[PDB]
Design a protein around this ligand. Sequence first.
Ligand SMILES: [Cl-]
Ligand SMILES: [Cl-]
Ligand SMILES: [K+]
Ligand SMILES: [Mg+2]
Ligand SMILES: [Mg+2]
Ligand SMILES: [Mg+2]
Ligand SMILES: [Mg+2]
Ligand SMILES: [Mg+2]
Ligand SMILES: [Mg+2]
Ligand SMILES: [Mg+2]
Ligand SMILES: [Mg+2]
Ligand code: NA
Ligand code: NA
Ligand code: NA
Ligand code: NA
Ligand code: NA
Ligand code: NA
Ligand code: NA
Ligand code: NA
Ligand code: NA
Ligand code: NA
Lengths: 46, 119, 65, 81, 194
Amino acid sequence: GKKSKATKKRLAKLDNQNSRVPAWVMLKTDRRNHKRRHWRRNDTDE
Amino acid sequence: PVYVDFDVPADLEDDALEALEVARDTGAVKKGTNETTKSIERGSAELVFVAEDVQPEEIVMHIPELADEKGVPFIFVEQQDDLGHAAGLEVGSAAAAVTDAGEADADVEDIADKVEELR
Amino acid sequence: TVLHVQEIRDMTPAEREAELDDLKTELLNARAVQAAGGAPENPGRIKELRKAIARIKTIQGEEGD
Amino acid sequence: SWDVIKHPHVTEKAMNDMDFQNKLQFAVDDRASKGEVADAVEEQYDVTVEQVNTQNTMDGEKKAVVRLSEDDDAQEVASRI
Amino acid sequence: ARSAYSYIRDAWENPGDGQLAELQWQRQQEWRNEGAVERIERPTRLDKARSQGYKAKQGVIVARVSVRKGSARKRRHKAGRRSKRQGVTRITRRKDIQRVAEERASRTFPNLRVLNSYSVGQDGRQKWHEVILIDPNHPAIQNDDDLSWICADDQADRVFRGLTGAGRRNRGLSGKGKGSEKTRPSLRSNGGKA
RNA sequence: CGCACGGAGGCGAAGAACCAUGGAUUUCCGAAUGAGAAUCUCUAACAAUUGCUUCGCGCAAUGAGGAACCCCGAGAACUGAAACAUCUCAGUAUCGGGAGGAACAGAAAACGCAAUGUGAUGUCGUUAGUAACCGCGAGUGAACGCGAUACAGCCCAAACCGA
Ligand SMILES: [Cl-]
Ligand SMILES: [Cl-]
Ligand SMILES: [K+]
Ligand SMILES: [Mg+2]
Ligand SMILES: [Mg+2]
Ligand SMILES: [Mg+2]
Ligand SMILES: [Mg+2]
Ligand SMILES: [Mg+2]
Ligand SMILES: [Mg+2]
Ligand SMILES: [Mg+2]
Ligand SMILES: [Mg+2]
Ligand code: NA
Ligand code: NA
Ligand code: NA
Ligand code: NA
Ligand code: NA
Ligand code: NA
Ligand code: NA
Ligand code: NA
Ligand code: NA
Ligand code: NA
């Protein structure tokens, strides 16, 4: 398939949202990324 | 056109409008269909003018038959704004009535006599 | 912090423009060091660089350039 | 208003183009054209730009590969800031 | 003495007799060839217009509107219905043709507001009315002690809410006593029973 | 130096943080209005419909949103009647259009305790499950008056004037 410039910006964001909760946040809050998505198991929009 | 039953020659109309102008300066004239109407009704009208390019026609239909049952003489005019300019207005008038002429009582009588012949 | 409001208003409609492009350049060179994962960072400075530009721009608007 | 040049793209591939091909890589604004990228580079570094190549990366940004002339030296420029 | 206006009125008591009869025969021919909403420079019935609110002034508009004659243009039921609700032919709408014309006119002039309207006749298959509209934004009207009220916010879209003259009558608000128990102060408040 | 108790560093007596009011900034799509498009692109733009008019988009208007309330139109059936068609559920559900901070109504071609009487309109209590409707079945169902709340009355068309 052919992705447009806008479509590309969105996939790009979703990929970034896929990162983990940084180690330093666990300490600052004295102790989970509920939006962890998988390319195969999950399904993005569009 | 429905209320018009005879055509008045351009030359006659010219005479009529000329006399009306000197009538506004010497004698007295009524400008407007309403004022023209009460003139015929009260009798003070000597010669009444009626434009031909009136739309709606209802504004003037009543004049012809009214003038007939009051002995008042009447004449037609091609354009509404010519009658208004003659009566001395920045706008036109659907009808005008000479309420007692002046310096033209002679001409008025002639035009009146001329029209009766024109039917 | 190192740049105060009074000091900005004391500038002329040209000095602020020069000072603007100056700050913008310091910022760019900071983000250049950051882009290369540079360690001589001063988190408070780069932060202040952004606010200063905002202040100068804010004053420019008030003063009519 | 948006600024054309965001920051220098410093990766191993970006260093090869620099040492071997006299090219400087930049992360720029995705509204900027090749022509607007060249101009900004010359005004921010005082060098002569020959060719620019762009890519709309999967990071929401635009990557520009600016090639300097033989008159200038890429390694010397990037090493100053 | 009788006003010149009283003559326009009298002719219209009998639109089928006299000169008005011949006039109407002629006019309608051009009317049938016109649109649904035609802005016109001068009202066909001066006396009625002025009586309703009309004024030869800036911001005062008039438009002739034709609507089809007859009952409702209803579609037959497509699902289950008891005999009482299977009708098509004898069903008529609760809004009258004059109020329909008023609406189609107000939509053509989205900035103006309906003042009133009157009938100018009909042929074998359509009816014509002339609506009087007013520009609430023109300062000539905003300083008119007779028409300024139609500038207030609560007068916005007045026709679509039945605040027009023909509107209030169709809503059965004429009578103040007997027979008006379910109509005043509103149809909706009385559970829709008129 | 947010939630958020880390690390590094920074800011504050040039009175910061924090709060109140006013202002600056305010990307793209969106009524979305130059034209097209799954938030982007292509070469100046109130697009469209209107009013006024210097007849030039020159001055203006409309559009869409809002928890319900409000007003004007369109209008079911399950159900009840121990079946069912009128009736009932109900002018309800739902649909189209529109206004406001509230809407609508409103200064008698009224009432009709018939009077030598009342005196704009809403609303609350009552009148009253009374009058009236109805396969006179099941069911349906007011008002005048009264006690209260709050109170406020006015402008045109025309006559006679005629710029
Ligand atoms: Cl309206
Ligand atoms: Cl009483
Ligand atoms: K039923
Ligand atoms: Mg990754
Ligand atoms: Mg390419
Ligand atoms: Mg109410
Ligand atoms: Mg567009
Ligand atoms: Mg049953
Ligand atoms: Mg019922
Ligand atoms: Mg039975
Ligand atoms: Mg009663
Ligand atoms: Na997938
Ligand atoms: Na980046
Ligand atoms: Na309108
Ligand atoms: Na009824
Ligand atoms: Na803002
Ligand atoms: Na506009
Ligand atoms: Na224009
Ligand atoms: Na049953
Ligand atoms: Na059954
Ligand atoms: Na029945």
